[PDB]
Amino acid sequence: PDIATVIDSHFEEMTDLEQEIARYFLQAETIQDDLSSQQVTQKLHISQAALTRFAKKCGFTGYREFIFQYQHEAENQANQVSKHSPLTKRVLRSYSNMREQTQDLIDEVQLERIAQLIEDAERVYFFGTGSSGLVAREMKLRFMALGVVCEALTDQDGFAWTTSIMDENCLVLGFSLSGSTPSILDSLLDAKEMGAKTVLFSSVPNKDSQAYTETVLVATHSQPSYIQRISAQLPMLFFIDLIYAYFLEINRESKEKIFNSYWENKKLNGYRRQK
Amino acid sequence: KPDIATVIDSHFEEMTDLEQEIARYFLQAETIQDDLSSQQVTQKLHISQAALTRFAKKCGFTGYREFIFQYQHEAENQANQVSKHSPLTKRVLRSYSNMREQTQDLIDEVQLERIAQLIEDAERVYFFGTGSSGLVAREMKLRFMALGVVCEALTDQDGFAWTTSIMDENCLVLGFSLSGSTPSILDSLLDAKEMGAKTVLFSSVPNKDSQAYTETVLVATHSQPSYIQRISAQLPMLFFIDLIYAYFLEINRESKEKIFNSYWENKKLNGYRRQK
Ligand SMILES: [Cl-]
Ligand SMILES: [Cl-]
Ligand SMILES: [Cl-]
C-alpha cells in the first residue's frame, strides 16, 4: 500500500492532533517541503516526539524512515514521466504502431498454410529487390538454418535463371512493399507459368486476388512521408518471424537437429580459430 | 456482444453463497475442459440440479441447459476468432514488444546525436557487418546515401581489407556485432582506428574491449532464451539505426530534403525519356 492508503487506513486510530499531521502529509505540495523533523515541527507547531509517534502509528520504525519512504514513493512516481524527446518518441511510436497494425492484419490460418507450403516444397525461392532483396536474404538465413533448400534472388537475372528451371515442386515468395514492383510481379507470373506456387507479400491489396497462390497483406508505415519512415524491411520481418515460428513446429525435432548441427560446427570452428 | 464470463461477473454480487461457489467454478479457465453436463457438475460440486438451475437463472438464463449451451458454444467459437491469436503468434509479437521496451530504456539521446553529428562531419562513412548485421549495413547505406552521405556497406573480410587500407582521419566506420565478439568486426574496427578513422560499435554485449572504439552503442538482447526461437537478429540494430537516422535527418534538414528530392526528380526525368 502507498503512503496515502496507510495514512488513510490509520487516520481513525489517530488523535485530533495526529490528524493535523496526517493532513499535512496528505497534501500534494508537501513533497516540495523540507521534511526534516526540525522544519516539519516548526511548520506544524508540534513536538519531535509527536512526529515519531505519528510515524509509528502508521507502522514505520520512526519519523526518519517514514520521510525517506515518503520520498521513495515520490521518486518512483516522478520517474514515470517520459524523459525522451519528441523525435525519439516518433521513432518508437513508428515501431509500436507497426506491431499493432501487423497484429490486426494477421490471418493465422493463412500463415500456417504458407508454413506448410514451405515444408511441402522441394525448392523454395525468395524474390525481392532493394530493401525487399534484404528481406529475401534474411528469410534464407532463417530457413536454411532449419534445413530448407532455398535461395534468395534479388535481380532480373536471378529471377530469369530461377524461373526457367522452376517446376511444380517449387515455391516462390516475392516481396514488394509497394505492391507494384514490376520485376517482382512479372517474375512471380513467370514462376507461376512454370508450375510453381507463388506467395506475394505487399502492403497494398492490389489486383493480385487469384493471381498468386497466396497474397499476404503487410503493414503500411505510420509516417506519411517517405523520408521520415523507419526501416522498409520491418513490415516484412514481422511476417517472416511469424511464418518461421509456425514452420519450426512442423516436424520440429528434425529441424532442431539440423540447427544444432550447424551450431556444433560453429563451436568447433571458433575453437580452431583460437587454437 | 458480452461474453458469458462478463455476464456471470455482473450477477455474482446478487448470488447466494452456494451460487457464488458455482460461479467461481465456471469462471475458471480449466472448467471448459471438464464434462459440463448437469449430472457431472452436480456430482463434482456436491450440489443439486435445482441449485444449478437457480445459479443459471441468476445469470439471466431460463435454466442450466440454456446457460451451458451458450457457455460451450462461446468456447468452441473462439477457434474462429481471427483476432484471438495462438500461443506461437503471441510469443512472436511479445518478442517484438519486449525488444521495443528494452531498447527504449537503453536510449542515450545525447550519444545518438553525437553519432549523427559524426556522420555529418565525416567525409566518408562505412558500415561493416556480416550475416544479418550485413543486411542492416546495406540498409543503412541506402538510407543515408539518399540524403547525400558518401557511404559504403561492407559485408566480408575482403571488403573490410579493401576499405580500411585507405581510411584516414575523415572517415567514420559503424560496425555491427550483435554478439559483441565477431572477430572480423572487432578486428576490422581496430584496423580502421589504426588508420585514424572514428569508430562506432553496435553490440548487445558491453565488453571491456569495446572501450577501444570512439563510441559503443548498447543494443537490446533477445527475449527468447533459446537461439532457435529468436526473432530476427537484425531487429536490435534496426531500432538504433532508425533513431540515428531520424536525428541525422534533422541536422540541416532542408539541404538533405533537397538531395532526397533531387534523387526523385532524376528518376522521373529518365522515365520521361524512356516513355519516348
Ligand atoms: Cl514509419
Ligand atoms: Cl577515436
Ligand atoms: Cl526473441
Could you tell me the three cell numbers for B124? Answer: 566518408
Of the CA atoms within 13 Å of residue B169, those in its CB half-sphere come to 0
Residue position matching grid coordinates 489486383: A207
Distance from C-alpha of A153 to C-alpha of A244, rounded to nearest angstrom: 19
Give the CA dihedral B44, B45, B49, B55, nearest 10 degrees.
-130
Among A90, A235, A98, CA closest to B246: A90
Q: Cα dist. B25→A207, B8, B52, B207 in Å?
A: 51, 11, 12, 53
Q: Cα dist. A105→A234, A238, B77, B103, B180 in Å?
A: 14, 11, 20, 25, 35
Question: Distance from B141 to chain A by nearest Cα, in Å?
Answer: 11
Distance from C-alpha of B32 to C-alpha of B35, rounded to nearest angstrom: 8
Experimentally, the structure was elucidated by X-ray
Which residues, including other chains, have CB under 8 Å from residue A219's CB and lie 6 or more apart?
A98, A101, A102, A105, A203, A234, A235, A238
Distance from C-alpha of A86 to C-alpha of A65, rounded to nearest angstrom: 38
Distance from C-alpha of B243 to C-alpha of B7, rounded to nearest angstrom: 47
Containing B245, the helix (H) or strand (E) segment is helix B235-249
Query: Quick check: B164 and B179 in contact, CB under 8 A?
Result: no
Q: Cα dist. A260→A250, A266, B1, B228 in Å?
A: 17, 10, 48, 9
Containing B220, the helix (H) or strand (E) segment is none
Could you tell me the three cell numbers for A2? Answer: 502507498
Distance from C-alpha of B273 to C-alpha of B276, rounded to nearest angstrom: 5
Q: Are residues B100 and A103, on separate chains, in Cβ contact within 8 Å?
A: no
Q: Give the type of residue at B73.
A: H
Domains of chain A are 3-78 (1.10.10.10), 86-271 (3.40.50.10490)
The distance of Cα A161 from the centroid of its chain, to the nearest Å, equals 37
Backbone angles phi, psi at A59, to 5 degrees: 85, 30
Query: Quick check: A181 and A232 in contact, CB under 8 A?
Result: no
Question: What part of A 131-150 touches B (C-beta under 8 Å)?
Answer: 131, 134, 137-138, 141-142
Distance from C-alpha of A216 to C-alpha of A87, rounded to nearest angstrom: 31
Containing A128, the helix (H) or strand (E) segment is strand A123-128
Backbone region of residue A45 per phi and psi (left: phi > 0; alpha: psi in -120 to 50; beta: other values): left
Report strand pairing: A170-175 vs A214-217: unpaired
Backbone angles phi, psi at A146, to 5 degrees: -105, 10
Question: Distance from A95 to chain B by nearest Cα, in Å?
Answer: 8
Q: Cα dist. A224→A99, A220, A221 in Å?
A: 17, 9, 7
Which residues, including other chains, have CB under 8 Å from residue B110's CB and lie 6 or more apart?
none
- DSSP class per residue in A42-61: HHHT--HHHHHHHHHHTT-S
- DSSP class per residue in chain B: ---HHHHHHHHGGGS-HHHHHHHHHHTSGGGGGS--SHHHHHHHHT--HHHHHHHHHHTT-SSHHHHHHHHHHHHHTGGG-TTS--HHHHHHHHHHHHHHHHHHHH--HHHHHHHHHHHHH-SEEEEE--THHHHHHHHHHHHHHTTT--EEEE-SHHHHHHHHTT--TTEEEEEE-SSS--HHHHHHHHHHHHTT-EEEEEESS--GGGGGSSEEEE-PPPS-SSGGG---TTHHHHHHHHHHHHHHHTTTHHHHHHHHHHHHHHHHHHHHHHH-
Query: Quick check: B60 and B42 in contact, CB under 8 A?
Result: no
What is the radius of gyration, based on Cα positions, of chain A? 32
SS3 A173: strand
Q: Are residues A241 and B231, on separate chains, in Cβ contact within 8 Å?
A: yes
Query: Quick check: A140 and A166 in contact, CB under 8 A?
Result: no
Measured between CB atoms, does A113 come within 8 Å of chain B?
no
Q: From the CA of A42, how far away is ligand 1's center (Å)? A: 57
Could you tell me the three cell numbers for B223? Answer: 527475449
Query: Quick check: A119 and A164 in contact, CB under 8 A?
Result: no
Q: Are residues B138 and A134, on separate chains, in Cβ contact within 8 Å?
A: yes
Query: Quick check: B261 and B268 in contact, CB under 8 A?
Result: no
Resolution (A): 1.8
Could you tell me the three cell numbers for B237? Answer: 540494430
Distance from C-alpha of B84 to C-alpha of A147, rounded to nearest angstrom: 31
Contacts of A138 in chain B (CB under 8 A): 132, 135, 232, 234
Measured between CB atoms, does B79 come within 8 Å of chain A?
no
Q: Is B71 exposed, middle or buried (0-12, 13-18, 19+ CB in 10 A)?
A: buried
The distance of Cα A15 from the centroid of its chain, to the nearest Å, equals 53
Containing B138, the helix (H) or strand (E) segment is helix B132-145
Question: Distance from A209 to chain B by nearest Cα, in Å?
Answer: 20
Query: Quick check: B201 and B177 in contact, CB under 8 A?
Result: yes
Q: From the CA of B214, how far away is ligand 2's center (Å)? A: 4
Question: Distance from B105 to chain A by nearest Cα, in Å?
Answer: 10
Backbone angles phi, psi at A187, to 5 degrees: -70, -40
Measured between CB atoms, does A264 come within 8 Å of chain B?
no
Distance from C-alpha of A207 to C-alpha of A23, rounded to nearest angstrom: 69
Residue position matching grid coordinates 506544524: A44
Neighbours of B148 (CB within 10 A): 15
The distance of Cα A123 from the centroid of its chain, to the nearest Å, equals 31
Contacts of B92 in chain A (CB under 8 A): 241-242, 245
